Symmetry: D3
Subunit: 182 residues, 6 copies
């Protein structure tokens, strides 16, 4: 019995492992939230002292609104459109992942606060001119919350400040790129 329970606890734990190999969201072909969590930790510890990484939270403006008028299948093709447009804007080695139903998250290896600032505009503007095929959408905009990733940073804290920057960008009228501590 106790033997069976220990045994089955082992198997469940294997299942958990298997579930970590499922590292990507099929819809958008980006990495999922949990795999990002695990990747970013790994990245933060590799950082030399006095070095930084780029980190941004990306939210699609009025996404929930698109679902009602255009139905759900449309709103998903919007999400796939962001993935496509982002894949095209981003350089190799940069980390993009799907952070929530409506949100994405970014990490840029060894990136300056100006490099940071630059990429987010490029992305954001590219979503404005974005043309999701087979869906006739009136408006397309995203807002960004940025910050940086210093050595000995705490991730839950690091994510809180980019979100702050993002929420402030959401009140700033949307289609806004806002930063925290540069």
């Amino acid at each position: 019995r106790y033997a069976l329970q220990a045994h089955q606890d082992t198997l469940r734990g294997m299942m958990r492992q298997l579930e970590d190999l499922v590292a990507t969201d099929e819809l958008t072909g980006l990495f999922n939230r949990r795999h990002f969590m695990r990747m970013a930790s790994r990245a933060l510890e590799d950082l030399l002292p006095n070095r930084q990484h780029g980190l941004a939270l990306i939210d699609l403006d009025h996404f929930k609104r698109i679902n009602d008028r255009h139905g759900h299948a449309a709103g998903d093709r919007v999400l796939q459109t962001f993935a496509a447009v982002a894949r095209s804007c981003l350089r190799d080695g940069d980390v993009l992942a799907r952070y929530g139903g409506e949100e994405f998250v970014l990490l840029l290896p060894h990136a300056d606060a100006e490099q940071l600032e630059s990429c987010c505009e490029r992305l954001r503007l590219a979503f404005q001119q974005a043309e999701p095929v087979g869906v006739t959408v009136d408006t397309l905009s995203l807002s960004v919350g940025m910050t940086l990733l210093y050595a000995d940073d705490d991730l839950d804290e690091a994510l809180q400040r980019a979100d702050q920057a993002l929420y402030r960008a959401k009140r700033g009228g949307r289609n806004r790129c806002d930063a925290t501590w540069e």
Copy 2:
């Protein structure tokens, strides 16, 4: 993208295989419903022509009441009580399994309708006699619905027939055993 969805689908297929290894219900120490379903299927097929298996559905009486008066922990004890009791009654090589919240299911290889009825009464009276440690019980009874698994049966159908007999045994005033096609 399709290779990814295919690959992660395999991943999930492996998770399900592992699931099928988690074959027992930890509270009782009995095989779970899913594992019973898989066993019974292969006992149905391995049936020689014009031969049979016994198959009863056991339900504990007023069990929900016990949970209400004595709390969910006593409910659990009662089930470990039944599990303990049943193992004293059954011959080595019988199949007994948890089937629902308070339902169990039995399968007796090559057992006459007489043999089955004999087994179930002995089980039924054994339960009635038992006392669970650390829980004072108004009293304990169970009902059973019985039937025979024939070669070329449908297992879902066979099962439907014992549930019919279990329904009548409940209706008859509980603590009894009814049958269908013997």
Copy 3:
């Protein structure tokens, strides 16, 4: 005894999952038939209404003869030749796979009947031009049979239709491309 057969059956289910991870054909470096079947199924389902995929069946001409004159090792080279060539022609994101001893199969996401016919000729002429290292070839050609995967198609049926076109292209005197429903 049934628990054993159930348990070992799971075991064999795991062996088959692992099988589905062995997704490529080592000689060519292309995806194998089984993996193609699993990919195409999910490309069929992911098809929006009134949209299509291209789908051709490629067969190399007089291949068996090459094995007879030049020996089974040259036969293999010719296939690595075709595999190399094809990868030069195809856009990133096409699906190409080994389908038989000498048969290959192609799938072009969102590709017009025009687009498909254009791709296949370019492939066809590219093969004709090629020379495999260390093997002197009388000459090289391939035939192809093409069709369109529609939403609500049957994949077996779709496939049956390209094999019909491939049959005619062989009949037409080889080194050509026939189609069915465009």
Copy 4:
């Protein structure tokens, strides 16, 4: 490529492992040939010097003959009958396995050549009085080839001499227990 091949060679090797966990023949519920091979090695090395094990090859006399007259389903129920009868004759900790379509093999921990000799008669005679249910069989007999398992023995050699004893028992009229080096 080479990377893919190394990778897929890894997976095939896992499959091989999985295949070693499938350690038992379902029909007779005994261990299969390969698991016996692996078990006996393990047992031979554990042996103290000047210590022995029992080893016997068991063949059912005229088994192929039963298949013709009584059809295959009968001959299998004979095999299951031997497994049953053997399970009953044998003590706990003794190793019985299915060695071939018609043959079985035995190992007895720390067994004397007289203990050896004794068990094989008990088994053999018990198969004479054996009554395979649902099959009307005229005759039931097996022959045995025995030997022993000394320290630093070679298994392929150890199995050759018990077979010799067995083949000699097959010519000795069948229903014969013959030994090699006691």
Copy 5:
């Protein structure tokens, strides 16, 4: 990538899991120390308030001296004997694990101080009376330190209690059983 980092940590996660499946000491056939640790967290948790388990630490007496006088293998044989013997003495469902080189550990489910003491005595004597074979050994004995595993208890603390109790019994002359909180 850092992705790569993550994916290999997962595989490493898996090996550890697979390691937890190797649950038993190969020399004796008992559960090993790690598997016991996990089985015993799980009993400690499943413990009703005002109820408890039996815990004992069993150390064989003058084992080191046995190795010197009779040789490493003879020592190993003595270990076997203790397992054999204990298997005889133990009610079904008692947990016996190898805890170290010459020390064991026993959990008794729902056992009384009085019940624990009776078991260790029956065990202490039985081992005294034993004769391993090979191996003639002049005399054997063990000493036992006991305690009770209550709810809200620390399992490592529980073991400290048992350890200390085992020390007093070694100090008190061996072939005895001391205890702590009974």
Copy 6:
């Protein structure tokens, strides 16, 4: 049982397998030494008669001294730089593995003596010109020992050739490439 012995050896078999999936050096992102060994048996086998592969052993120059003067992390950074650099220089489909603490190994598929030498020179110079970032480092260089991997060759012998050639280049003054049978 001995059965138990067998079953845990199988699990042990599995861990080893899982270990072969950890194929890449986490610091550099290159294949590790074991994965290379396996990739290279497989190329050696797939080699047509009178045909061959390129083999080189790359050792960074005065690495130990770098660690002492700039610190362990700086050394580690230099290793990264070499990977980055080599990735740029290498045709797609070249095999580069980390072979040791400061040494690499390169297989070139179907490469000429002349082709190998050209690659190592382009590599030797490129690394000379490089600037890791962090990290200011006064100067970098490596030395290269080369040979050809023929059919019917021993891969360990091939490596001996390369090793020796690497020694002559260290001895000859470093920042060079010696060779053995070209």
